[PDB]
Amino acid sequence: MLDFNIEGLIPKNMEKRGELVLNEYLKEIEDVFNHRKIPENGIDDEKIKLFLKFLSMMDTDKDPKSVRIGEREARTYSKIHEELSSGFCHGIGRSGNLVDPQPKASGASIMYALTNKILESFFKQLGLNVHAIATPISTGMSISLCLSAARKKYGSNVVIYPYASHKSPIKAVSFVGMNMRLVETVLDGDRVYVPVEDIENAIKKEIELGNRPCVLSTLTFFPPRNSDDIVEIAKICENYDIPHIINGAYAIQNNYYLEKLKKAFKYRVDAVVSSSDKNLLTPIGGGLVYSTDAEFIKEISLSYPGRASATPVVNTLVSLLSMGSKNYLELVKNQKNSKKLLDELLNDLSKKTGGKFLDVESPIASCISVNSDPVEIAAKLYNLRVTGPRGIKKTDHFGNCYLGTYTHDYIVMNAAIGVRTEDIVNSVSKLEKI
Amino acid sequence: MLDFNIEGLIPKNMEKRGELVLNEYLKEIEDVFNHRKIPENGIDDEKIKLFLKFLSMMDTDKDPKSVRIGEREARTYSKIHEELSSGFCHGIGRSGNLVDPQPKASGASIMYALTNKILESFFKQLGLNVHAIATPISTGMSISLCLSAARKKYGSNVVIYPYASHKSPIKAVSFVGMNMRLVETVLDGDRVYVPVEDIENAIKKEIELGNRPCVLSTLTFFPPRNSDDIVEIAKICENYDIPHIINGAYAIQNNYYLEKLKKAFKYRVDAVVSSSDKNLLTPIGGGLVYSTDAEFIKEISLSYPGRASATPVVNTLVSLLSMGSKNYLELVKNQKNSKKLLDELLNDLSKKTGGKFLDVESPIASCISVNSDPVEIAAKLYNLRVTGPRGIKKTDHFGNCYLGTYTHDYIVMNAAIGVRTEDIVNSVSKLEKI
Amino acid sequence: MLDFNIEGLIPKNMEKRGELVLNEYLKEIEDVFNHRKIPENGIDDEKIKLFLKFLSMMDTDKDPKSVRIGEREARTYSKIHEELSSGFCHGIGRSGNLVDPQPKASGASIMYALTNKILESFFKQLGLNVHAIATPISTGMSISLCLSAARKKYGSNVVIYPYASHKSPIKAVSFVGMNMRLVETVLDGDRVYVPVEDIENAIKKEIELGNRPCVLSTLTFFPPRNSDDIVEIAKICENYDIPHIINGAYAIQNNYYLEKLKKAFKYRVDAVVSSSDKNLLTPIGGGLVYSTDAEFIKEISLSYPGRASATPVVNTLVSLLSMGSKNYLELVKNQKNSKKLLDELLNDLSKKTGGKFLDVESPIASCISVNSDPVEIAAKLYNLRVTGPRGIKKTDHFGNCYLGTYTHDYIVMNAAIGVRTEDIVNSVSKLEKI
Amino acid sequence: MLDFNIEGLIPKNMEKRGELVLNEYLKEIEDVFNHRKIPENGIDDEKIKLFLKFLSMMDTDKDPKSVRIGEREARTYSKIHEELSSGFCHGIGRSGNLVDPQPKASGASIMYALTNKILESFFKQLGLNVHAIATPISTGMSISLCLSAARKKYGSNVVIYPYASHKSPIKAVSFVGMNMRLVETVLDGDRVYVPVEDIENAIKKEIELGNRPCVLSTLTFFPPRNSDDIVEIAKICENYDIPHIINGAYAIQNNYYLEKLKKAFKYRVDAVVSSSDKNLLTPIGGGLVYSTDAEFIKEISLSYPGRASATPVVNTLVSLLSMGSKNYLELVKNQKNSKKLLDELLNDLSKKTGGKFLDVESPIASCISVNSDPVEIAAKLYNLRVTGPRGIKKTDHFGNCYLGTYTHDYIVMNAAIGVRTEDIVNSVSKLEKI
Ligand SMILES: *Cc1c(COP(=O)(O)O)cnc(C)c1O
Ligand SMILES: *Cc1c(COP(=O)(O)O)cnc(C)c1O
Ligand SMILES: *Cc1c(COP(=O)(O)O)cnc(C)c1O
Ligand SMILES: *Cc1c(COP(=O)(O)O)cnc(C)c1O
């Protein structure tokens, strides 16, 4: 892989060992190029920087002999720029097409293509045979891309939306100027869900009126609400021959959701969208979009206007190469034990106060009831180093994802992938104190 | 600004001299916090990194004594992740609200607020008292933002678009799902433009249809195409009480463009969008949005679904601080000379060959007609490491930004900000060898 | 500790929390300055770099308002210079005085004073109440500094040297231009050693000749040879009032050696020299000199002609801060387990090989006698990726540190401070294949 | 140089282009390996780091498949360690032989060797065809290395030393434990010099009493003292067949001294020693030893006890690659222009008061006599942000390099290579305000 004139400096024996050593050290980098799969063992940072560097040197703006008189030559002022862009100053993709190789880049294009290959590989490790693409934008902004693709490929003009009250997906629908048709949730004990029956009727109504609907199902949401029946909805859509897009914000981190996706993929799921920071532990900013429909993923990368920053994509490529499949499946295992601990501990506090360890579906988050004002108990936690706890009032429509009155005033906590025991033990402790 | 126990280690005169030094060194950093203006002298990389680290250590996730049990606690896996994000793992803003401080960040919120004030300061220096926001997305996507803001603020549902053949802004309209009323260009010998009389006309038409027209004008585009009459368009939109958005990709780097803007703001201009890389020499992937109406900027910052990456915004702050006002003016002066050098050389090349040094409006690019296939000539140039020169056919509609048959086969070159003298000479020279 | 203007950008509650985070993040650095001892827990790389930056910013050459008209003003050319010196371009100390602060480098002088104070606390927690100095040169060169000192202070002109076959110390003696009185080792079963009796007779013979003897003993050496009776030699050097220098190459890591040191300091011991790399896992290049005589340590720092590089001294500080007292004890504890494993694996290997798990004093290394050429076996090992084991014929005089004929042909392996359970199991299995 | 599998990812023509850019970007690095000379143009820091990386990867500790159970595996605890050592954690040289390749580190050995060859092509370009070696220690310690080499190779046992009152070289002769015969200086106007006739009789006299004399002459020294008649001493040393070592601390930077060395090599010069910080804008800590005798360079190399840190040697390398020969010449020319600016300015201040502009030999330093206590003036300058000025009393024997009463109380200022105009103008106007 690497070879340079080193003769006449050291004796043959040392010369050969140095070469043997140099090749072995570079082996992990060489395999990525040759196998393009998520490595079993995580690769060290310095070795990944050397990898990104090998690709960054292939971009046009790195040529010392070229005469540059273009309109966007990608000149940068500070070195700090090269650090943040990882050397990919020309950003990613060609105008109006993300996954399309940029003639001025070349290095950035290979890293993008390699990153999607490895993402797809990662999915196969998890049991999902899909076509995947890392997106340089939020998951909500990524949903827009999907909504926009369906809108141009099938003609969608209205979105059937099983109620999921999160600012992102809601704003994504309005961002693309598409009409929404909500589908209220219903109460059932301590839960809230959306009857697949009402969705099918919403779909029928829209089709009766002359529209071409498409469903935006939601697979991962806060405790109160049940993951939608992705499988069922997926059948309906196939029967009606309508596009189905799934908001899988944090579906990739655990089996509970992966299985639903596996079974839903049997029928119609045009695309799934997932957060890269919630699932691959990447800093905020990027998304993962996957599906069994190669045709649809391409359209998705054709919805993005202009060129984008390569940084978020590189961050993903960095989670994949840095963690590796072993360490990932291990974080997933640690998740399970963290959750259980979170339950068989939060349930104990139910004995102390009034009680009632709510019985919700979430394989990540738990909920406990309380008398005091949730919002206040929450803020009282914010001011105790605790980050992430939610305090919802039974009268909090948006927070409960239920238009009527909810049955409890609670405090939900999460056991996301990568959560440390301390986050659990001590979050519960700071809780008892109130 | 910085203080720590140093006593009982070194003599007093050294202890004192030492403190004196640490203060002078930080002087540039604290001046940024105190004044919040673009400094006259560019600050060196090491100091900017320290400035960014200071802000970085204020973000929740860096609290060694914190407790995260949230659904999204910004846990990163690799240090590389911190480098790329520059320590802003949480990213920028709240969900669907870019410029609204993120409770879990703080340091990231400060940094962004500073970027925007340092951005405005920078604009003031250039002669424009405007409200500005650095966006974490491409200029095309930034236009989608502005469009979407026009939709929820003034209910606009149609975009009047004086023909400007560029994939990104065109897609930008399609993405937000708004119809487009195209206003073709007219040929005028060597120049191509869009009659203002026709734009107002298109305005009256769409209004008669019951729609609420919105104007997306183009101030900066390739040679054949003139800049749209931004000032006249702004008067019209003032009269009809109709929104006006201006695609001003590379308006900031040149005085010719800044002047029309200064005049245009005299009337109605809700927003102007510029590439952060074409003007602040940042890697591709950043945007600059500015306007005299603070109310519209707030709306623009509420159009982005979800939370965004912090990186492109940090690239913009690195440019302004690293660059400084002095150097920027120097860069601008050099383009004026580099341009005039380009003009005369090309004019010289003319005469010796078939001739004809096209007379176009652009202050950065120049053209010269040729009696051979333009695409083959540009090809040969590429074969000489000359990057950027375009070879357009008189029949290439998208190239000439004209839907008819242009009057010439030519080659265009640019004297973009940052161009070297050798580049102009080492370009017109090679073209002559052809 | 860190105060900069942040008002008028973020709401009060986020302002407050922002600070709580910032102070907490720096608490560890703040504690070093306040306590100046080895931290209980290790400090991460970023905090240490930050800590070192704070100190280097106090160096005269970093002063933007400085005025430098000297022949030696640390003008450096490349940023890499800064990185490698860690910001200490002036180095440490003054010409001929390492410990004496540099008026041109208050920062470099502070980190060095701190490094020495922190190093002394590291020792006290290992049970040694001493004055320690981190030296900018290897242990062999460090020994020269000691010998040079013993000459300035006591007029020493001859070194009685209990035979220890390591090229470094022997070359240290000749470098300082001092004659050497080599006290041959004697055989005793599987062990070789220098009888305290013949060391005394050597000493008294040099005094009879009218010379001022100096004793350079060796506490740490390869298995074949026992450690020198430091306690007796100290008892003797004292009665004869003669300087005693100890080569404690790798005595810091093993408590077996520390104990002998503790009991030997009750007598005559001017200084002990240890390698920073072998005990603190530092890159090769530095040393550690120490004793109960603050007077002798002062003279030692006045024996290095000219000014020294800062780097090796910083590498030693990084080790102390990076590890922490806690992590260190685990290393020492893990080494006890690795040695137990090694011995029981080698012992079992000898039962089925041809026998003989040699009886040697080494706490870190153990030997197995072989029935065939050792050099060959050690070469088969070397060829199998195993590095470090030595193969030694019963004839190799330098290798057995015995001028007579050693009773065995053997292989010796080490279980030094950072050895992994896998390497030992592995290296032994491969020894078995052979 | 670089070759990895990139097919089936990008269109072929782009694939070729990226491969061309990559190769062109690696040219400067490719040349260092093939040519092994200082490049006409300086190489940017990023490529220098990469170059160092290709080398560090060859060291035996970076080998992943290796089983480490040796006594000195070069294990490192912090990533900072690998940064301060530039990857060469095993240091440089074998035990007791610097320039000899270390079987444990082919990388460090390769780099060291390249550095010595590149250092040699730098001298050749300055007019000196010499054998050179970069050392990991101070020029003073480097002088001890030569003295030691002289002692072993030729049997020297007494240093003839023309008085050069600098703690460093004086300490070097003392360190090596050699008897020093001082040859006093004589007063002649504002100059102090060592008559060669005095030197020769000293040699003669030492030979007389059976001893074997070695001459340590000083070529570069503080203003008052003239440079020893290096050429004559060299001629004389050849006639007597006696070793000759020259202290050329800062001779490389000024042609005035290089011309003297050229004429001097025409006779007898065993070795010259120079500071790499004062001549190569390197951080403090490294030396440069050179001579036309390759046999003597090996001997010096065999004078260092043990293994050494690689950092000082990497610093020298970095300086040669970073500056380039073109820039080095611009530094040499700026200093001549800065020297004259220092003079005329000091002559002006001469008239402002009593003061006399002393007529000294120094091509880099110049002095102005003053009536008040020079030591109090040098102190005031310090307070006023000035480092480097010397304030010597007519009675200060060590400061004047003369055992009698010098004829002036004066202040010394330098215009060493790399000095800024601001340092010069501001240092004088600061002296003026006093
Ligand atoms: C460069 C440019 C843009 C911006 O495109 P993005 O990829 O979104 O940065 C838009 N319009 C014109 C005319 C341009 O030249
Ligand atoms: C986190 C999350 C998202 C993604 O939000 P972005 O800010 O766009 O990354 C979307 N939907 C749900 C239910 C989420 O929890
Ligand atoms: C490691 C060691 C030395 C010192 O070697 P240097 O290369 O000078 O650091 C000296 N003696 C012994 C017994 C050693 O183990
Ligand atoms: C500066 C100087 C020295 C000191 O060199 P070190 O690197 O500190 O050993 C020695 N001799 C002369 C003449 C000097 O000018």
Side-chain angles (χ1 to χ4, degrees), chain C residues 71-72 94-96 304-308, chain D residues 137-143 161 164 166-170 218-222 247-250 274-278 284-287:
Chain C
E71 43 169 45
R72 177 116 103 177
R94 310 168 86 178
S95 60
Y304 185 87
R307 287 172 51 178
Chain D
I137 25 69
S138 72
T139 152
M141 183 63 85
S142 293
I143 286 176
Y161 185 66
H166 187 289
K167 308 171 61 58
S168 185
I170 286 184
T218 293
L219 179 62
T220 58
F221 202 77
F222 309 104
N247 173 349
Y250 50 90
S274 293
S275 130
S276 66
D277 57 297
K278 298 173 173 178
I284 281 69

Side-chain angles (χ1 to χ4, degrees), chain C residues 226-243:
Chain C
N226 292 332
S227 318
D228 278 313
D229 191 324
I230 296 307
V231 175
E232 273 303 22
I233 298 170
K235 290 183 174 174
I236 293 180
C237 278
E238 192 150 71
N239 293 323
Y240 286 76
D241 189 334
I242 244 66

Side-chain angles (χ1 to χ4, degrees), chain B residues 34-235:
Chain B
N34 293 1
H35 308 305
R36 305 167 180 176
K37 308 293 183 54
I38 184 178
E40 284 191 357
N41 290 158
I43 304 170
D44 59 67
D45 294 358
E46 47 246 292
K47 287 180 188 179
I48 296 182
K49 273 176 58 199
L50 200 64
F51 162 68
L52 291 169
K53 177 68 177 307
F54 284 169
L55 293 178
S56 162
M57 305 177 293
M58 293 182 78
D59 278 11
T60 270
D61 54 312
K62 272 60 176 177
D63 192 332
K65 207 166 188 175
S66 70
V67 186
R68 284 98 94 293
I69 36 68
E71 16 60 62
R72 166 136 79 180
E73 50 264 292
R75 309 170 194 275
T76 55
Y77 196 81
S78 161
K79 294 196 77 303
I80 288 168
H81 287 309
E82 298 251 357
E83 291 183 44
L84 297 178
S85 67
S86 192
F88 299 104
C89 307
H90 270 295
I92 293 301
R94 291 258 271 180
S95 175
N97 194 3
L98 233 47
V99 194
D100 184 5
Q102 163 57 220
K104 265 136 80 168
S106 230
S109 304
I110 298 290
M111 98 85 52
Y112 191 32
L114 284 189
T115 294
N116 293 324
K117 288 181 173 307
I118 299 171
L119 183 67
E120 288 165 43
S121 163
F122 166 83
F123 273 103
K124 180 166 176 289
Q125 306 291 189
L126 288 173
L128 302 169
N129 301 294
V130 303
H131 293 297
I133 240 75
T135 61
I137 38 186
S138 69
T139 109
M141 189 69 90
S142 292
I143 289 177
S144 291
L145 253 45
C146 291
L147 293 170
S148 185
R151 217 216 319 265
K152 60 214 300 181
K153 176 68 125 298
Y154 310 114
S156 313
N157 49 241
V158 55
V159 177
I160 304 305
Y161 186 75
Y163 198 48
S165 67
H166 193 299
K167 313 286 185 52
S168 188
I170 293 177
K171 191 156 297 183
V173 172
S174 192
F175 193 29
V176 293
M178 292 200 197
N179 314 77
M180 171 181 79
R181 177 60 176 61
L182 202 172
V183 191
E184 310 176 319
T185 51
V186 165
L187 186 159
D188 183 355
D190 250 35
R191 301 188 166 195
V192 143
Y193 73 98
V194 178
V196 174
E197 185 166 298
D198 297 327
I199 298 180
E200 182 187 0
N201 227 70
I203 291 189
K204 294 188 295 176
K205 188 183 180 177
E206 291 301 311
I207 275 184
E208 296 184 68
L209 287 165
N211 303 311
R212 284 184 175 175
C214 164
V215 182
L216 208 223
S217 63
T218 303
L219 180 62
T220 56
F221 203 73
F222 281 74
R225 170 78 150 55
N226 277 178
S227 304
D228 287 321
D229 192 335
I230 287 303
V231 185
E232 211 65 9
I233 289 173
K235 276 189 177 71

Side-chain angles (χ1 to χ4, degrees), chain C residues 268-322:
Chain C
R268 183 57 169 285
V269 170
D270 301 73
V272 179
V273 179
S274 289
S275 341
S276 62
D277 65 304
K278 291 170 177 179
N279 302 288
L280 297 176
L281 307 192
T282 217
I284 284 183
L288 315 164
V289 188
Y290 51 115
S291 74
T292 52
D293 197 331
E295 301 174 56
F296 200 68
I297 260 73
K298 293 173 177 293
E299 188 58 21
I300 292 176
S301 71
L302 313 179
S303 305
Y304 185 87
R307 287 172 51 178
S309 165
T311 304
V313 176
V314 171
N315 271 328
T316 291
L317 174 61
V318 164
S319 276
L320 296 167
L321 301 187
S322 181

